Amino acid sequence: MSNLSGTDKSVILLMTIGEDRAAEVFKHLSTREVQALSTAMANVRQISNKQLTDVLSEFEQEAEQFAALNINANEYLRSVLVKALGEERASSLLEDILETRDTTSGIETLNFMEPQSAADLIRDEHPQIIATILVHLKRSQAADILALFDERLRHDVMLRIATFGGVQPAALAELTEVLNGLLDGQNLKRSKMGGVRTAAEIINLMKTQQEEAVITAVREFDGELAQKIIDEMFLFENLVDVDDRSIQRLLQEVDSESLLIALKGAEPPLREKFLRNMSQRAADILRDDLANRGPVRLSQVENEQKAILLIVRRLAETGEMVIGSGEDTYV
Amino acid sequence: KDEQLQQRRANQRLGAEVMSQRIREMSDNDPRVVALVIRQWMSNDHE
Amino acid sequence: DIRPYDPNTQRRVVRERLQALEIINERFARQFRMGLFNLLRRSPDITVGAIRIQPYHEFARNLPVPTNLNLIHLKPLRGTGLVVFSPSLVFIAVDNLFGGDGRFPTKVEGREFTHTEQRVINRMLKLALEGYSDAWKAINPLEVEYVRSEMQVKFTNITTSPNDIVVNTPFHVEIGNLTGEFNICLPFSMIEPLRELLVNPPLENSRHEDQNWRDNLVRQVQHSELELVANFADIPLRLSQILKLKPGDVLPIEKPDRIIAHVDGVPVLTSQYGTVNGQYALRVEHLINP
Amino acid sequence: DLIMDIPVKLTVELGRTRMTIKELLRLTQGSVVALDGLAGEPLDILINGYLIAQGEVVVVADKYGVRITDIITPSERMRRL
Amino acid sequence: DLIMDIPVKLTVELGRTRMTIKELLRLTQGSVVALDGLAGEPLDILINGYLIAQGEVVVVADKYGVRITDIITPSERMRRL
Amino acid sequence: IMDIPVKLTVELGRTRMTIKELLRLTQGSVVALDGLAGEPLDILINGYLIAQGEVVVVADKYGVRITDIITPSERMRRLSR
């Protein structure tokens, strides 16, 4: 039983399985292991029939003893989190867990840390150093960093990215060790807790005078921020709780095409709530149009929805309906 | 003695081919499983 | 030529021609070209500039700010040295090291050196110090040690005073179409003990021949007569007394127990006085030996 | 006129000799060196290295002192030049 | 009498200062000590340590020199001690 | 160790001259010193040479920056001149 290293035995298995199966195994391997067995099959020697048989038999035993679970190890987490705690908390926990697999070098920490901090850190860096740093990072992160530099340095870094010639290994190792030493500060992970969609939730609560003053102040400070806050403030769900008379009034103001486009993205409960109030002919033709018209881009649906939201706001300012968080109890 | 050796070699290669088809089926069934098995192998070279 | 002298008129006229230093500079330039070929994987050509022996403040005022100032120690010589890497040269070296071909224009606006550029400068300085020590080994062996680096000329203070005379040696580094400069600056007091060695190189066979020459010199100077003057006594007088002085007067004097014998005023030995053979004689008690 | 004080340094020289560096380096403790000046020959007196007079050591009431036997002249000064 | 070929020592004092031993020992490399006299005052020309003249500095073809302005009066001499 | 005051003085330079020029001295007469312009001036303690340093001007006051403490070889080299 010749001193057949386990790496070379794995190389034997990869050779025996086939090309597509080898690619499938490669897709589930880490980079260091990929390079290791790539070198192993680069300096591969001949394998005897008996040693081949022994290796593949012991691999059969290992596969039989270990094969279990591994159904959707990654997708299962996403599906369970989305089903249990909603999309936003699912994404938050997914980011938290996928961040637990730490970097080995600070260069990848530059990928996981806020773009403003990166721009502040590497602005003083050498333009070629900036180029080398930006190449290793994710494309979106590099774009975010570059969007903060001034025009001259940004153009210089872009030009150097275009004509990169290849960094020496020792210099790259020194740069990596410098980044590791500097980024050795315990944890960056600036907690995302709080922000938009929470301010609107708060504003939905207090007195009309206070909230109108607050939104006026925000609009004075920033019009787009105020518009976003107002848009999140209402949310296109509580129209089911604006009762039937509001729907009856609203259909006197909403065009048919905008309503038809908007109802495509609406939930079945909201669609039924809107349909069940008007005349049979109107509800029937609206349902037939909804079932007949083809799919429409989401942005157009949101545009029509925002138009009817403007209509709703202009009609509520007149007091023709009541928009209340408190559910209308019927006895 | 030569014919016995050659037929023994033929039987060995036939069995190797058959169970190699078995590996091919297993790999197209659970490539993640064969991948984590070879992960065990990579971890245990160092022991 | 009758002009009123004023302070800060450092008309320091110390003109010399250190041929040995020029030879050492050429050897160091060759060694540094080999080192840069090893490092950058490109072949540079370095032109050795004329040795500028100028006051320190004048040297510092011409240095661009910021710049890489590397303090070095030239053991066993007392004092500290300086190795200057101009921002252009460090720009070229870093650009070549980190994948850039250098075809882009050199854009030096003025900024401090980060840690990565500090590592690159440290590598270049190690190579340069090795080359400098190797060059100096042919004449006088020294050990060169890196101490620290500074970005401002005020943080170094290489000499005691800004008017002290210093030796500066500029080298021009050329790589393709990119030009860079770097300087080696040594205080003149560092090489003052080695002034006679640095001035004249006209010797190639000197390990034991130096000892033979020194032995010949000492054994041949031992055949020259001197001027031994023994001051018997020391009488202080006023100039009126000298003018009024007449023969026959007696001058009081504190009693000299020990007679000091000097040569051209330089004290040499102290002795008791006496008479032998009818001549004044001195019995030596202690030679003047620091 | 105003130079009547100008404190000066009168020195008397005991003798001079012609000796090479060999003996001088080889002079030791207690070794005796002779001078060209004969005993009883009046000593020489100088000021800042220039001749000023010729004097002889005399005993005056337990206090030995120098007595100027002669004041220099330009003639003898050139003779001793 | 005209016994006057004697050579004499001439010195020029840039300034004078009184300072204690602690100030002496505390002095280090490059330490600068202030002089009592203001800049531009006439310096003191001394002969063997005796003040005879006052004058400011001048350079004569890279050679140090002084320009004498006041020489003889002792009317202020008692102050200088 | 002691707290005695000492009069620190800085001397511009020396001059070895006979009193010919001394009697010929007058207001405006040129005098030459032994020291060339540029070398450090001598700082003395009670007339004893201890150090050499350059002259600086601060707040319109003359000042000397101590450059280096002298060595005995330099002391006797200066003495024999």
Selected residues 13-72 of chain E with any CB under 8 Å from a CB in chain D: 47-50, 52, 71-72
Q: At what angle do helices B31-44 and A6-17 cross, to 10 degrees?
A: 160
In a domain, F2, yes or no: no
CA–CA gap between residue C22 and residue C26 (Å, rounded): 6
- Please indicate whether, in this complex, the C-beta atoms of B20 and A27 are within 8 angstroms of each other: no
| 8 A C-beta contact, residue A131 and residue A161 | yes
**Which residues in chain B are closer than 8 Å to A6, comparing Cβ atoms?**
41-42, 44-45
In a domain, E1, yes or no: no
In a domain, A323, yes or no: no
> Which of A39, A66, A93 is a domain's end point?
A66
Q: Which among B16, B32, B42 has CB closest to A7?
A: B42
In a domain, A151, yes or no: yes
- Please indicate whether, in this complex, the C-beta atoms of C244 and E1 are within 8 angstroms of each other: yes
In a domain, F73, yes or no: yes
Its domain, for residue F17, covers 8-79
Burial class (CB in 10 A: 0-12, 13-18, 19+), C173: buried
- What resolution in angstroms, rounded to 1 decimal? 3.6
Q: What's the structural domain count of chain E? A: 1
Amino acid at A62: E
CA–CA gap between residue E41 and residue E57 (Å, rounded): 9
Q: At what angle do helices A19-26 and B31-44 cross, to 10 degrees?
A: 70
In a domain, A289, yes or no: yes
In chain F the first and final C-alpha atoms are separated, in Å, by 36
In a domain, F3, yes or no: no
A278 touches chain B (CB under 8 A): no
3-class DSSP state of C223:
coil
In a domain, E40, yes or no: yes
Per-domain boundaries in chain B: 2-44
Per-position b or e across A52-78, b if 16+ CB within 10 A of its CB: bbebbeebeebbeeebeeeeeeeeeee
**What is the domain-level CATH number for residue F65?**
2.30.330.10
Token pair belonging to A203: 């504003």
Domains and CATH numbers, chain C: 19-204 (3.40.1550.10), 224-287 (2.30.330.10)
C272, β-bridge pairs: C283
Its domain, for residue A116, covers 104-193
CA–CA gap between residue A120 and residue A145 (Å, rounded): 9
**D80 CA to chain C: closest CA distance, Å?**
15
CA–CA gap between residue B37 and residue B29 (Å, rounded): 14
In a domain, A45, yes or no: yes
Q: What's the structural domain count of chain A? A: 3
**Which residues in chain F are closer than 8 Å to C164, comparing Cβ atoms?**
67
| 8 A C-beta contact, residue E35 and residue D74 | no
In a domain, E67, yes or no: yes
Size (chain E), residues: 81
Size (chain B), residues: 47
3-class DSSP state of C114:
coil
C85, β-bridge pairs: C68, C182
Chain B residue with Cα closest to A17: B24
A38, β-bridge pairs: none
What chains are in contact with E, requiring at least 3 Cβ pairs below 8 Å?
C, D, F
**Which residues in chain E are closer than 8 Å to D7, comparing Cβ atoms?**
48-50
- Provide the phi-psi class of D30: left if phi over 0, else alpha when psi is between -120 and 50, else beta: left
User: Which technique was used to obtain these atomic coordinates?
Assistant: cryo-EM
Residue A254 Cα distances to A288, A301, C46, E26, angstroms: 18, 14, 82, 94
In a domain, A132, yes or no: yes
| 8 A C-beta contact, residue C167 and residue C185 | yes
